[PDB]
Amino acid sequence: ASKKVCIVGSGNWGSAIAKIVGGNAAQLAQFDPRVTMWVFEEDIGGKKLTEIINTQHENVKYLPGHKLPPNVVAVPDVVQAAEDADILIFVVPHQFIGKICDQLKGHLKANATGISLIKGLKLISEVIGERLGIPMSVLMGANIASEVADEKFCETTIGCKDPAQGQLLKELMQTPNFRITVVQEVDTVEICGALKNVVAVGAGFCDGLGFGDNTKAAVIRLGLMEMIAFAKLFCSGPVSSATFLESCGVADLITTCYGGRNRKVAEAFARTGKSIEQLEKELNGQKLQGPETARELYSILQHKGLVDKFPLFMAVYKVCYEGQPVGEFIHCLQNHPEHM
Amino acid sequence: ASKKVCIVGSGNWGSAIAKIVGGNAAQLAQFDPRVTMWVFEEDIKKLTEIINTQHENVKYLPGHKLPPNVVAVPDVVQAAEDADILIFVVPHQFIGKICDQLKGHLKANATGISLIKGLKLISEVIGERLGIPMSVLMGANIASEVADEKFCETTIGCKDPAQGQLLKELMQTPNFRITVVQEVDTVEICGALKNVVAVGAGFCDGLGFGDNTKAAVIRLGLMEMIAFAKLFCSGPVSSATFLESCGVADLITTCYGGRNRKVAEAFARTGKSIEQLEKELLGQKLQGPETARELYSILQHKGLVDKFPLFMAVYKVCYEGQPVGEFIHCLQNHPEHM
Ligand SMILES: NC(=O)c1ccc[n+]([C@@H]2O[C@H](COP(=O)([O-])OP(=O)(O)OC[C@H]3O[C@@H](n4cnc5c(N)ncnc54)[C@H](O)[C@@H]3O)[C@@H](O)[C@H]2O)c1
Ligand SMILES: NC(=O)c1ccc[n+]([C@@H]2O[C@H](COP(=O)([O-])OP(=O)(O)OC[C@H]3O[C@@H](n4cnc5c(N)ncnc54)[C@H](O)[C@@H]3O)[C@@H](O)[C@H]2O)c1
Numbered sequence: 053a054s055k056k057v058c059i060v061g062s063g064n065w066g067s068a069i070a071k072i073v074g075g076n077a078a079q080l081a082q083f084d085p086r087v088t089m090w091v092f093e094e095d096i097g098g099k100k101l102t103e104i105i106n107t108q109h110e111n112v113k114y115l116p117g118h119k120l121p122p123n124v125v126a127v128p129d130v131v132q133a134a135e136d137a138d139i140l141i142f143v144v145p146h147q148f149i150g151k152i153c154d155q156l157k158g159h160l161k162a163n164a165t166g167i168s169l170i171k172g173l174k175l176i177s178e179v180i181g182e183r184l185g186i187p188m189s190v191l192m193g194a195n196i197a198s199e200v201a202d203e204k205f206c207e208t209t210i211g212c213k214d215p216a217q218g219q220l221l222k223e224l225m226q227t228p229n230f231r232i233t234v235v236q237e238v239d240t241v242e243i244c245g246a247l248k249n250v251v252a253v254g255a256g257f258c259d260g261l262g263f264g265d266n267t268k269a270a271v272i273r274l275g276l277m278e279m280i281a282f283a284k285l286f287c288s289g290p291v292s293s294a295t296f297l298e299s300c301g302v303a304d305l306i307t308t309c310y311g312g313r314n315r316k317v318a319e320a321f322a323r324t325g326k327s328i329e330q331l332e333k334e335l336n337g338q339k340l341q342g343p344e345t346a347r348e349l350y351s352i353l354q355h356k357g358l359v360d361k362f363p364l365f366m367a368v369y370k371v372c373y374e375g376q377p378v379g380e381f382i383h384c385l386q387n388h389p390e391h392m
Numbered sequence: 393a394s395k396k397v398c399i400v401g402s403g404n405w406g407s408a409i410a411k412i413v414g415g416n417a418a419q420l421a422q423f424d425p426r427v428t429m430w431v432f433e434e435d436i437k438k439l440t441e442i443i444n445t446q447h448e449n450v451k452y453l454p455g456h457k458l459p460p461n462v463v464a465v466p467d468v469v470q471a472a473e474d475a476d477i478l479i480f481v482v483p484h485q486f487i488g489k490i491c492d493q494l495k496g497h498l499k500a501n502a503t504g505i506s507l508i509k510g511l512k513l514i515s516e517v518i519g520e521r522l523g524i525p526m527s528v529l530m531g532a533n534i535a536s537e538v539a540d541e542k543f544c545e546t547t548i549g550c551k552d553p554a555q556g557q558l559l560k561e562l563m564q565t566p567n568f569r570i571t572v573v574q575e576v577d578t579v580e581i582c583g584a585l586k587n588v589v590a591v592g593a594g595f596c597d598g599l600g601f602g603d604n605t606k607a608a609v610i611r612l613g614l615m616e617m618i619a620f621a622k623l624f625c626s627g628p629v630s631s632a633t634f635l636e637s638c639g640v641a642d643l644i645t646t647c648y649g650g651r652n653r654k655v656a657e658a659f660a661r662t663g664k665s666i667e668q669l670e671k672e673l674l675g676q677k678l679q680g681p682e683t684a685r686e687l688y689s690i691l692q693h694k695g696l697v698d699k700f701p702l703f704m705a706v707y708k709v710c711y712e713g714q715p716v717g718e719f720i721h722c723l724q725n726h727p728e729h730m
């Protein structure tokens with residue numbers, strides 16, 4: 053009764069995660085060696101991507117140059133991929149998860165579990181757990197696919213309520229260069245991923261206004277406190293300050309505020325006066341996560357009269373959407389709740 | 393009734409703190425505007441003279457005016473003896489002799505706060521020699537920026553509520569924001585331990601590792617700071633205290649821009665010894681490596697050397713010739729992931 057794994061997704065992250073999962077699923081006796089990977093079919097040079105993956109063991113489109121363990125089987129039909137699976141690993145861009153869940157509903161093993169790697173503010177893991185009826189875990193941290201594929205050292209956090217399922221997901225994904233901490237707070241692990249991008253816009257505003265590292269450190273820390281307080285006020289699950297010390301909190305926050313794309317655009321916006329829109333295009337055209345999340349935060353907070361409790365988050369919103377001069381951003385932190 | 397302040401020290405940080413304290417003592421009713429500041433005498437004319445006449449510590453806070461209600465005083469007993477609040481702000485190497493001179497000479501019920509950053513806690517050395525209750529002030533700050541009124545925060549650790557609130561009023565400005573917490577030891581130990589983590593962060597930069605690897609090193613450093621404090625420190629120790637400025641913020645500022653970091657990187661990137669890079673770039677002694685060696689002695693006595701692989705990797709690369717290129721291997725079986 054070794055557990056069967058299906059990787060629902062085969063993009064950049066899915067393919068890199070497949071390198072690890074395939075290896076661990078072969079080596080460890082608690083897992084079935086046959087790992088299916090749902091691959092949305094595509095024509096590459098008049099050839100089928102699933103076919104290329106099953107003959108060359110390389111995702112020539114989304115992770116070229118890397119070999120996948122040969123026990124990882126591309127399957128183009130998502131129902132066929134997942135139907136005998138004990139563990140599903142959801143790793144697709146957020147815009148497709150709905151349709152995927154609408155094709156899988158009613159078709160999963162009765163005992164199937166899920167972990168979401170997908171990073172009105174409802175948690176994507178809840179969208180999946182509700183539509184499919186499976187317990188959901190999450191996998192979040194300061195990490196990127198290219199580096200994980202290159203075995204460059206980094207960590208991630210796993211949020212999973214059940215201890216035995218947590219231990220199993222760790223076994224499945226942990227390597228010497230991809231280190232895992234399991235915690236029981238799914239909602240907390242998961243919400244960090246959206247909030248951190250609001251803070252990084254503020255961090256970039258700090259850079260673009262010409263301030264130094266000690267000011268930027270203050271902006272990030274206050275951002276973190278606002279992330280914790282907001283998660284305690286919004287999330288159903290239990291929420292502890294100590295969970296934000298995991299990779300999903302402080303590490304992802306700092307890697308984003310110091311080297312993120314949201315930060316680069318934010319900086320350029322403050323130094324130049326060019327709009328957020330123009331800078332996204334000039335620096336491919338993919339929109340910024342932070343600003344839209346801040347708008348969504350404003351709606352939630354404004355509807356409960358707490359806009360005042362979150363000056364960083366709200367200052368990000370007002371500069372991005374209500375014409376507040378970016379040069380006021382620091383002023384907005386001079387009477388912060390943390391210092392009352 | 394009105395509380396008097398004495399700033400013990402007149403250097404870069406003491407002079408910047410004088411600007412804030414002088415400003416605030418003059419303005420707020422509950423402090424005596426007369427703020428004494430102990431100034432070790434120098435021939436700049438007489439340094440104390442220069443300050444008191446020209447109100448600028450030309451040598452230490454250059455390009456700034458100090459408030460006129462701050463009085464340079466060349467003898468430390470005279471500066472302090474009427475003070476209710478003593479602000480200790482001198483380099484570590486001097487605080488011993490200064491306490492030796494102050495012992496027994498202080499006002500009844502005097503209190504102190506240490507700004508001295510850098511195992512026995514300096515606030516305890518001061519409080520034990522002088523027999524006064526001690527607080528600490530520590531965070532992601534530097535005097536130049538604080539003199540220029542550039543926005544930053546700090547943490548005060550103070551066991552007594554009314555005393556913490558008094559220190560917050562004395563030192564807080566719109567661009568110098570304070571959070572008061574009750575855990576003195578926890579606030580203070582961060583300042584020593586952070587520089588070890590910074591050395592490791594610097595190794596990352598010099599070996600060419602990416603931001604996500606470096607973030608992992610910093611984070612693991614922070615977990616090691618917390619665990620070491622819970623193991624080492626008197627008084628209560630809270631994980632959440634390390635979310636304050638003295639913890640995570642001072643740690644990231646030091647790891648993305650400190651002298652410990654720059655030297656560590658150059659050592660990893662060029663191969664040039666730490667002694668050599670100390671002489672060239674500073675021959676002032678990097679603080680991170682020595683703290684690491686002290687940690688190693690302590691952890692041996694407790695049988696815990698295996699539980700702090702980041703701290704002990706810094707130590708072994710710096711002192712036992714472990715190759716810096718293998719630093720990351722020591723983090724691949726970390727207690728955090730067990
Ligand atoms: N790339 C990274 O380094 C990284 C790191 C951490 C988290 N993530 C997260 O993983 C998730 C996926 O990221 P990615 O980089 O792998 O995306 P991607 O663009 O590389 O993924 C392409 C995949 O998306 C699916 N897909 C594409 N078009 C589809 C369509 N018309 N209909 C149905 N499905 C379609 C398919 O499964 C396809 O294989 C995101 O939520 C992301 O934030 C990525
Ligand atoms: N400079 C900063 O930005 C900053 C920021 C935070 C914390 N600190 C810490 O504050 C403490 C003081 O730092 P600083 O930058 O003001 O140092 P500094 O070197 O500028 O201090 C000069 C002072 O040191 C004393 N001193 C010098 N020679 C002496 C002697 N022979 N005998 C007795 N006393 C002598 C005198 O009080 C002199 O005014 C340190 O622990 C430092 O880590 C500094």
Ligand SMILES: [K+]
Nearest residue numbers: 077078080083
């Ligand atoms: K197996």
Ligand SMILES: [K+]
Nearest residue numbers: 417418420423
């Ligand atoms: K006064």
